[PDB]
Amino acid sequence: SSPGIWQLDCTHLEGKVILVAVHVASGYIEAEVIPAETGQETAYFLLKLAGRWPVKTVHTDNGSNFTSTTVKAACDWAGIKQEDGIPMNKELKKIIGQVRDQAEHLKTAVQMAVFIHNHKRKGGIGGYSAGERIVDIIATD
Amino acid sequence: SPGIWQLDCTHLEGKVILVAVHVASGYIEAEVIPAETGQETAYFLLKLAGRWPVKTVHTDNGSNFTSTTVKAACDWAGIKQEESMNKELKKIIGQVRDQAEHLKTAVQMAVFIHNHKRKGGIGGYSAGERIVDIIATDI
Numbered sequence: 001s002s003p004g005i006w007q008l009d010c011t012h013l014e015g016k017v018i019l020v021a022v023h024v025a026s027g028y029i030e031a032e033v034i035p036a037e038t039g040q041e042t043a044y045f046l047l048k049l050a051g052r053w054p055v056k057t058v059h060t061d062n063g064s065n066f067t068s069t070t071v072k073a074a075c076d077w078a079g080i081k082q083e084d085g086i087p088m089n090k091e092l093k094k095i096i097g098q099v100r101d102q103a104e105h106l107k108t109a110v111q112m113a114v115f116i117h118n119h120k121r122k123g124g125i126g127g128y129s130a131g132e133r134i135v136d137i138i139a140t141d
Numbered sequence: 142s143p144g145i146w147q148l149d150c151t152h153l154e155g156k157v158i159l160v161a162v163h164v165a166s167g168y169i170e171a172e173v174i175p176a177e178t179g180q181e182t183a184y185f186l187l188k189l190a191g192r193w194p195v196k197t198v199h200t201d202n203g204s205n206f207t208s209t210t211v212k213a214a215c216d217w218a219g220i221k222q223e224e225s226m227n228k229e230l231k232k233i234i235g236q237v238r239d240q241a242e243h244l245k246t247a248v249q250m251a252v253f254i255h256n257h258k259r260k261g262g263i264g265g266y267s268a269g270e271r272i273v274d275i276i277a278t279d280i
């Protein structure tokens with residue numbers, strides 16, 4: 001698994017849309033709640049993500065939001081290879097349910113769940129969080 | 142420290158730009174928000190802390206930071222509250238503004254350009270490489 005590969009996926013909750021980007025090699029995630037899976041929101045999500053991390057390749061579910069010209073033009077501007085149809089929503093929903101009663105709004109609880117996921121030590125006390133893994137995988141010097 | 146950030150706001154076309162700068166690297170995160178409110182501030186900070194190791198954020202004096210929701214977000218996330226990379230962002234947004242209809246988009250292009258731009262000749266690093274290098278070194 002190359003360090004520049006992300007998987008993008010969507011999850012629906014309380015009638016709202018959660019776009020999730022998973023850095024495949026570390027398990028690190030980024031997520032936003034969006035009003036609906038349109039091309040403008042997808043392009044915007046991908047542009048932000050690509051500005052924050054080295055994004056070489058995105059694997060998608062090939063939803064209609066990805067075939068939109070807006071999103072193709074975003075990947076092109078940002079130098080992203082878009083790979084439609086190339087194959088933890090359950091995990092993120094579980095964690096959202098554990099913080100859900102501390103947030104007045106879903107979107108807040110989503111960011112709380114992201115924080116928790118990315119900080120969680122994976123595989124024992126000597127292991128590493130997703131956050132530690134991504135920076136270790138990506139640091140070049 | 143790897144964990145020190147500075148947050149500032151920029152006003153433009155009647156929208157507000159919240160800019161967080163990672164002080165040791167120059168790396169930026171930015172969002173356009175309809176208005177500089179306590180709720181938008183809290184959400185911005187919560188997103189930042191889930192994405193990078195945020196220990197301390199230095200802020201301007203303003204009321205958005207006094208909010209009880211900001212205080213709750215900070216307490217939950219372990220954040221303690223206490224220019225060159227800023228007017229540079231505004232210059233970049235200018236250079237690319239015509240490439241996009243909405244300000245939001247131009248802002249995110251400019252954050253992309255800033256964080257990927259090699260400083261110096263062959264041998265140089267971008268702000269994005271500095272931050273990951275600083276933080277990986279610290280682990």
Ligand SMILES: OC[C@H]1O[C@@](CO)(O[C@H]2O[C@H](CO)[C@@H](O)[C@H](O)[C@H]2O)[C@@H](O)[C@@H]1O
Nearest residue numbers: 032033034035045107172173174185245
């Ligand atoms: O410019 C707002 C822009 O950001 C999105 C998510 O991609 O909205 C989320 O992030 C904003 C910035 O912090 C918040 O203001 C917003 O409340 C939050 O859902 C976009 O949907 C939106 O167009």
Ligand SMILES: Nc1ccc2c(c1)S(=O)(=O)C=C2
Nearest residue numbers: 052053054256257269270273
């Ligand atoms: N090359 C490289 C390494 C890390 C990072 C970037 C580039 S970035 O600037 O895109 C953000 C983090």
